[PDB]
Amino acid sequence: EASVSPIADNEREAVTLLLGYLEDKDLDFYSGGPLKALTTLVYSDNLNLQRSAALAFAEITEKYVRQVSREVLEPILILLQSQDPQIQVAACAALGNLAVNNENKLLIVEMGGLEPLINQMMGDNVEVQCNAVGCITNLATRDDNKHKIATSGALIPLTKLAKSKHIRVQRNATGALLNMTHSEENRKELVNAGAVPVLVSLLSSTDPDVQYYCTTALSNIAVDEANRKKLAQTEPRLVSKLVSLMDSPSSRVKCQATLALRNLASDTSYQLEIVRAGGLPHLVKLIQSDSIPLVLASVACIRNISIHPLNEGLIVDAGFLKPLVRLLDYKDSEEIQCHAVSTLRNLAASSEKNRKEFFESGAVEKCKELALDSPVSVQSEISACFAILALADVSKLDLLEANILDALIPMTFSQNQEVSGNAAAALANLCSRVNNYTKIIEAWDRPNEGIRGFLIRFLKSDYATFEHIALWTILQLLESHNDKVEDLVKNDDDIINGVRK
Amino acid sequence: SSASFFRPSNPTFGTSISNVSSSKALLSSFIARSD
């Protein structure tokens, strides 16, 4: 007995044909004779003949990566379902080879190739896990496939494999999970699949790639309000782990941890918690770094943190004022400059209590210098900060002595309503209820038609708000009880006619 | 509307979207001999 009968006639011919094909040093394996021979073996009930085809597929695809037919992929996807580990390894290697091609990435998923891969990842053979998770990451490079991977049920095996002790497996699993964070729907699927606890624990990973992938994935996840809510509810260790990663020896990891904190800084509770967790000393160092990425991330994150009024005192105490002003020297980075000015405006708007150190920082003079030779977005931030500063009666004269009118008057000429309107409002408040009009009088006809020209121009404006600012400014001057100031208005025919007509 | 003077600034945020011994021997064991 012992299988007295031999191999089938058609399978013997397939064996001989395929061996001859593989021995030839030339040959299209994906179309005719070679493909028919391979398919015959992949249909044999002899396991060794199936191993021969799976091994041949892997060798062929490792040397011939082309766009293939369904007739090439069907036998491979059959072999993926084998109970035989050797057949599974080779067949997955072959599919992984073919999946580096872009068109193959689509046809494989369209044919249900994601099914066999998911189950192989749930198995216990580390080599099949590795080839399957690599084929999965390779398929996910195309955005068309990402959503259906996210809903296929594959995030569960990717989450399990992210906990694997083999670093090849773990890097690929976390890399794949990272690839699923580029859309809100995909981030939602990945959160719903339970991957957040795993990503957070792997922030502690000793491999630099793994902790980079998981830091970047959590940062992307934190971009959605609904995910920040669940993070705050189920991940108490998240902020401390990210703060610790701001000490990473890798600039790449330090940058992504800071970007994650910035995203989680959108919610008031995280703006406080990051401060409570000790984030301020790291950020004040990072904004002084020479690494452009480090500065971009840290200034964006302190800007978000400074939105919270209860953080103003601690931010000033941590010494942010002078380093923030030095950031205005990045005259080629609009993003750095706007974030720095916006941070300073937030601090000025929260409290007047540190206004003295605000002035000693050089912030007013530096903003004055940028006001005219900076982009309009930077102009928008500076003019708004000036408008905020001009509200406090306690610092109005200090602002005027600093010659702030030399910046404000030119800005009222701007074609951008934000710049012009912010500067007009600042000017109006500076004329209100001050007890020294020396600087106002000096600026009457001084830089850019001084104040007189500003009133005449805004009295004519088609914008009802701009006209109102001029009329209200004139009333401030008329109420100054300064004989000279009142005469500047009351003895000016051009201002009188602008008011009347 | 007086509360508009208390409207907090919009937070800045962002994502990072950057993507990231032979079959011959086995076959030869099945080659048949013939005259």
Curated annotation (Swiss-Prot), chain A:
ARM repeat intervals: 24-61, 62-100, 102-141, 143-182, 184-223, 225-266, 268-307, 309-349, 393-432
GO MF entries: identical protein binding; protein-membrane adaptor activity
Crosslink (Glycyl lysine isopeptide (Lys-Gly) (interchain with G-Cter in ubiquitin)) position: 63, 501
GO biological process, one term: piecemeal microautophagy of the nucleus
PTM remark: Palmitoylated on one or more of its N-terminal cysteine residues by PFA3, which is required for vacuole fusion.
Database matches in SMART domains: ARM
An annotated GO cellular component: membrane raft
Effect of residue 37 to R: Fails to undergo self-association in the presence of NVJ1 or ATG13
Principal cellular location given in the protein's record: membrane
UniProt modified residues of type Phosphoserine: 3
Subcellular locations according to the entry: Vacuole membrane
Effect of residue 48 to R: Does not affect self-association in the presence of NVJ1 but fails to undergo self-association in the presence of ATG13. Fails to support the cvt pathway, but does not affect the PMN pathway
Membrane-topology descriptor: Lipid-anchor
Keywords assigned: Isopeptide bond, Lipoprotein, Membrane, Myristate, Palmitate, Phosphoprotein, Repeat, Ubl conjugation, Vacuole
Subunit and partners: Interacts with NVJ1. Forms heterotetramers of two VAC8 and two NVJ1 or two VAC8 and two ATG13.
Note in the entry: Present with 5680 molecules/cell in log phase SD medium.
Comment text on domains: Comprises a flexibly connected N-terminal H1 helix followed by armadillo repeats (ARMs) that form a right-handed superhelical structure.
PANTHER family the UniProt entry points to: VACUOLAR PROTEIN 8
Similarity field: Belongs to the beta-catenin family.
Purpose: Functions in both vacuole inheritance and protein targeting from the cytoplasm to vacuole (cvt). Involved in the formation of nucleus-vacuole junctions (NVJs) during piecemeal microautophagy of the nucleus (PMN). NVJs are interorganelle interfaces mediated by NVJ1 in the nuclear envelope and VAC8 on the vacuole membrane. Together, NVJ1 and VAC8 form Velcro-like patches through which teardrop-like portions of the nucleus are pinched off into the vacuolar lumen and degraded by the PMN process.
Protein name, UniProt field: Vacuolar protein 8
Taxonomic source organism: Saccharomyces cerevisiae (strain ATCC 204508 / S288c)
Name of the gene encoding the protein in the UniProt record: VAC8
From Swiss-Prot, chain B:
Naturally occurring in which organism (per UniProt): Saccharomyces cerevisiae (strain ATCC 204508 / S288c) (Baker's yeast)
Name of the featured protein: vacuole-related protein 17
Record's subcellular location: Vacuole membrane
Protein family (similarity comment): Belongs to the VAC17 family.
General function of this protein: Vacuole-specific MYO2 receptor required for vacuole inheritance. Binds simultaneously to MYO2 and to VAC8, a vacuolar membrane protein, forming a transport complex which moves the attached vacuole membrane along actin cables into the bud. Once the vacuole arrives in the bud, VAC17 is degraded, depositing the vacuole in its correct location.
Subunit details: Interacts with MYO2 and VAC8. Interacts with ATG18.
